[PDB]
């Protein structure tokens, strides 16, 4: 809510909930999934962590995708 943090969670559909936000890292493609009940600050933190993990760990050799419910890509 105020102190927003990231935690590594194992890769499964059961780990997803609607109240938080999620960052799926698949190498050259990074997907940002936002919940419907997710708020403003963790959306901003998800965007900031996404641009950080693109431009620092991969040095811009990635493409960040933003999606929500119903608009999930094929990846």
């Amino acid at each position: 809510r105020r102190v927003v943090r990231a935690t590594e969670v194992p890769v499964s559909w059961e780990s997803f909930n609607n109240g938080d936000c999620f960052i799926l890292d698949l190498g050259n493609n990074i997907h940002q999934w936002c919940g419907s009940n997710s708020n403003r600050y963790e959306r901003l933190k998800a965007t900031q962590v996404s641009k950080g993990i693109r431009d620092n760990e991969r040095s811009g050799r990635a493409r960040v995708h933003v999606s929500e419910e119903g608009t999930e890509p094929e990846a």
Partner: protein
């Protein structure tokens, strides 16, 4: 995290004023920006007959008042009435003294400079706030969505503008503005309601036509097939109840009114629709950043609250763009108040405290400090 603040966010849009505190999830006072003055003879002495009514009480007594909007297509016209509006929203709605609270205000792009100097002059001299900032509405709407890359189509009651921002950097040469919004849709609906014999001339009748536009109108997916369906059958007709007890019915006028947004030639303007305005807003940007801007179309404002406008927008942009591109359109359900929500974010950020225009900067630099600090 982000540090606390005692700032106020006051979206002073063309139809509504949305005022509240920074850090909160919703604006505390939402009320339409009108000033009502009586046009009838007051024969009953006493009982507090005011010379002017402001806010929601002006909506309550609108039959015996003439109503004026001091904001006309984003430009503030009558400064005394709009000063009365800020006095009402500081003292009567929020019930706070502005002397110990910074204030954040909103403005459309490509407004005249004299709006910014006069807004600076009445905020610093009259109310004596300790700080001020003014920001673009579409930047604040993109703050609300949480994204950084995207084109925002912000359409209030007076101004409909396209702003593309790639990463953190806006492109000022690609800013489009069109004076086609809910005022002109309300006036066009008032024109086409005479085809069924219903006459609406006064300002309270303009408020009633605004209510029927909010409550019944919708965007058709394809205009000619929906016109043939409405001509063939009578299933599309719907009813509405006047406050005096009369009942009216409307058919094709449900979808002919928002079609002015996609075809402005109904009201005599040769400028093209909002879809082509979005398309050449994308085309005026340079070639490397079209891919991300197609997939992050964001709408905001009450004028984007029609049902079915996202599907028509998707079909028109999918027709205009080349077929290999994926086009995604973001329409959150809280997009009416997204300007204020992003304002609460931007007032609540820790970085922002070294961009407040303080009192001493205004005293040393005149009202022209705001163009060197803001935008």
């Amino acid at each position: 995290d982000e540090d606390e603040t005692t700032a106020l966010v006051c979206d002073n849009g063309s139809g509504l004023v949305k005022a509240g505190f920074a850090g909160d999830d919703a604006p505390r006072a939402v009320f339409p920006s009108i000033v009502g003055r009586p046009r009838h003879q007051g024969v009953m002495v006493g009982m507090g007959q005011k010379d002017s009514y402001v806010g929601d009480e002006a909506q309550s007594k609108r039959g015996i008042l003439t109503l004026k909007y001091p904001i006309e297509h984003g430009i503030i016209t009558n400064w005394d009435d709009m000063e009365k509006i800020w006095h009402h929203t500081f003292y009567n709605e929020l019930r706070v003294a502005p002397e110990e609270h910074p204030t954040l205000l909103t403005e459309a792009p490509l407004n005249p400079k004299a709006n910014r100097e006069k807004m600076t002059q009445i905020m610093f001299e009259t109310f004596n706030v300790p700080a001020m900032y003014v920001a673009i509405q579409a930047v604040l709407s993109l703050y609300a969505s949480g994204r950084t890359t995207g084109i925002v189509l912000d359409s209030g009651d007076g101004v409909t503008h396209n702003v593309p921002i790639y990463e953190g950097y806006a492109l000022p040469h690609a800013i489009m503005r069109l004076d086609l919004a809910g005022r002109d849709l309300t006036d066009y609906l008032m024109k086409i309601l005479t085809e069924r014999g219903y006459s609406f001339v006064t300002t309270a009748e303009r408020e009633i036509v605004r209510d029927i536009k909010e409550k019944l109108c919708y965007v058709a997916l394809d205009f000619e097939n929906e016109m043939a369906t409405a001509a063939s059958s009578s299933s599309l007709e719907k009813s509405y109840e006047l406050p005096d007890g009369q009942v009216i019915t409307i058919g094709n006028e449900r979808f002919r009114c928002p079609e002015t947004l996609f075809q402005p030639s109904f009201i005599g303007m040769e400028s093209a629709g909002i879809h082509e305005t979005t398309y050449n807003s994308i085309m005026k940007c340079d070639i490397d950043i079209r891919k991300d801007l197609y997939a992050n179309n964001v709408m905001s404002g009450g004028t984007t609250m029609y049902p079915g406008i996202a599907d028509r927008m998707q079909k028109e942009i999918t027709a205009l763009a080349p077929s290999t591109m994926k086009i995604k359109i973001i329409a959150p359900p809280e997009r009416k108040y997204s300007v204020w929500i992003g304002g609460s974010i931007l007032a609540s950020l820790s970085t922002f405290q070294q961009m407040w225009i303080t009192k001493q900067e205004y005293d040393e630099a005149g009202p022209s400090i705001v163009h060197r600090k803001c935008f």
